[model samples]
Target: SIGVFYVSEYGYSDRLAQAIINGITKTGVGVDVVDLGAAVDLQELRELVGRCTGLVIGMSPAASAASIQGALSTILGSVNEKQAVGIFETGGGDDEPIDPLLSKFRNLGLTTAFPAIRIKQTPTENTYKLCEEAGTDLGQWVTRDRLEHHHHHH
Candidate 1:
């Protein structure tokens, strides 16, 4: 399973998050989606990360460093190298570059689960559909990785 969390300042991110979730579940894999604003605390967030095989983050450029640090604090200190990660962004014109963020996850020893997904201001129908399909691809990636690891070890 994968644990996906998103920070939606204006609701667009949430819509994309659900689209990803829909795509993920369509592949018959389970995913846990958390709204950062509603998350209880670092402990709860850590547990969610600890239990999942992969991770995804959908956020906006306005998200503060403090919030991102908060979400990744436990992960930075204790995450295993086996975990893979992906990122998505919802921002106004000129989608924010995700390379820096993705590099941070790599620094934490997590593999790239897939390429980053970025949706420019107010997603068009095409972008929405693209997100749904991206989610499906993400789910497939996680499932395939799990099976590969299992087969190699057994």
Candidate 2:
């Protein structure tokens, strides 16, 4: 399954998550939404993210490297190069909020599911359609890559 996680720094963005989940479902792939900023607890975050062999990782707000880690630091420790990763950002504009963390995951040598989905201000069906398409694309990458990884090890 591909785990889709969101940040709530700016606001609550749910439908976009659902929109992408809709497409991921279209691919016959499984998905889970693990939002950040709902930092009310972390004791259970461990097992939830452990389900991630593939991820539709989302970012939002003006996240500097520092704050990004505060939410995802432990999660980062878990990903390896063999898994599939795609990034989505709900942000104000063209600038990506996930770049710092992208480089962090890059150091782990993960295969990034290309063409990161940037949900710009969350309006119109076009972006939702884009999320769906992106989810489809990433969903394919997730299975194939993890399929290969599956063959190699446990």
Candidate 3:
């Protein structure tokens, strides 16, 4: 299963989250959209790791390192094997800022858990659509690459 997951304070990143899911679903791939706010169980995180085939993480400053670490910790060695995508919001700006969350994920040593794709968006749909398409494409690319690698090694 491909997942559209979001972590944000006050859960304001929903529009982008929905848009991402929309684009992902457009690829004719089934996807699960998870609002981590609604799913409180740490074990649920592990279950998600166990259940979903891929992950798409949306960016929000409210999504702390603790929340990510908590969820990821539960599934650390379980092997989800899903590609991770980071959808970056505009940071409430016009310049189309870059996301700090991607760097945070990298610095936190979660790099190898899954390769991440970053999508930048504007206040509206401006770059969000692009992000959706790019994120979906990146997920497929990661899946394809993993398949090729597995095939090569096998």
Candidate 4:
């Protein structure tokens, strides 16, 4: 199954998304990760969302109504048969509360919502610990590994 990871705005989201993928792919599941923020065209985002059964987003940029509509248009038919996961970072350039962004995802009818992990600062041990735990928790659900066994996998 193809998995597409979407991150809007900056590169930090990509890092977090990768961490999530690292946590889950250890179970030997294959995934196709894609970054929309890095892409030059918004159309790529639609295609990625349509192609993958599993979709993950790092940040909810101020998507204009048109953009959200385009996304939903593709997603409604594309993801109905698949699982969707939403992830948010607690610390970022975006000053808005993360809840609204998460709500947009929930409103879109995703299959799962991964909470925003507190990323206080870079290279901080505490931040690392938080991300590790978040990844572990999400891994259990997506990969079906027990939380205790999350760290035990390859």
Candidate 5:
């Protein structure tokens, strides 16, 4: 399963997240969604790293949602080289220089599901297709990686 974290204060990102979800489910994977806009008080946030095998991040850099920033720190502290992570940035997050924090995820040695997904302010039908493809690719790859590790225990 993958834990999806999105800055849900607005609607556009939600559509993008759903597109990714549609793709992941296409491969029969489960997705756990964490809505950053309303999750500042959610206690289980700290434990998601242990509970989910993969993580997907969807948010904008221009818009700052404290809850997400908080989660970012928590995730960085808890996540290690064993998990998988991917990120998608829509619109505003890129009007400025992209956030360096995204780079740190790769530096930590976790599996990178894909290159960062960047979309323009307006999404075309093609944008969604790409997102779904990204989802499917990551879902399959993560599960395959998980199985490889399980077989090594013998």
Candidate 6:
């Protein structure tokens, strides 16, 4: 499974999250998307984190630092370091970076599922395509990880 979660203030991040989900599903894998803006279901979120083989998250420049911090604080303990992870940022330009969040995940020793992705505030068709490709790549990583785990267990 691939889990894509995001915090969208103006819906741009949410659109990117949907694109990722659409791309992941293209590989015939199960995917769940959580919009942190709507609500926080900690139990369900934890379950998704616990069971997923790959995870992707979208961050936005418009979101408050406190909200991002709160989300990170809530999720840090729940994420398994073994799961493949990827992150993307939604913003007007490259000024809104994802390095801090990427570094945080790296500090936790989580393996990356794919390279980082960045989508502009108003994405072009190519940007959406790239997001989808990232999603498909993430799904492939999840498949590989699942197979490796299965082989080890069996």
Model 2 steric clash pairs: none
- TM-score per candidate, in order? 0.71, 0.69, 0.58, 0.55, 0.75, 0.72
Query: What TM-score number comes out for model 1?
Result: 0.71
Best by TM-score: 5
lDDT of 1 by residue, 1-154 (tens): 6666665554565677778777777767767776664553766566675556776665544444445556656666655766756555444443244457556776766655444444556666765576677667766777777787668653
Query: Ranking by lDDT, best first?
Result: 5, 6, 1, 2, 3, 4
Q: Where is model 6 poorest over a 10-residue stretch in terms of lDDT?
A: 89-98
lDDT of 2 at 43: 49
By descending TM-score, how would the candidates be arranged?
5, 6, 1, 2, 3, 4
Task: Single out the weakest 10-residue window by summed lDDT for candidate 5.
Answer: 90-99
Candidate 5 lDDT over 9-123, as tens digits, reads 5656567678888777765776666665555544656558565578776555445554456666676666676676766544534423334775676566676655644555665
The C-alpha stretches of model 2 lying farther than 4 A from their native spots are 7-12, 63-68, 93-98, 114-123, 148-154
Which digits, one per residue and each the tens of the lDDT, describe model 3 over residues 57-96? 5444443434554565554555433345444444442212
Sequence-dependent TM-score of model 4: 0.55
Give a tens-digit lDDT track for model 2, residues 54-127: 76654445443344456466666666656766665555453365566567666877766545444556545665
Pairs clashing in candidate 1? none
Better of 4 and 5 by TM-score: 5
Candidate 6 — which residues are off by over 4 angstroms? Answer: 7-9, 62-64, 92-100, 113-120, 149-154
Stretches of model 3 off by over 4 angstroms after superposition: 7-12, 51-53, 63-69, 79-82, 87-89, 92-122, 146-154
Q: Which of the numbered candidates is closest to the native, going by highest lDDT?
A: 5
Off by over 4 Å in 1: 92-101, 106-109, 113-119, 148-154
Q: List the residue pairs that clash in candidate 4.
A: none
Residue by residue across 32-142, what tens digits does model 4's lDDT show?
566544453556555665545455554445532224534455554555543656454545444354466457556766566546554553424444354445555644565
- Please report, in order, the local distance difference test score of every candidate based on alpha carbons: 0.62, 0.61, 0.53, 0.51, 0.64, 0.63
- lDDT of candidate 3 at residue 47, scale 0 to 100: 56
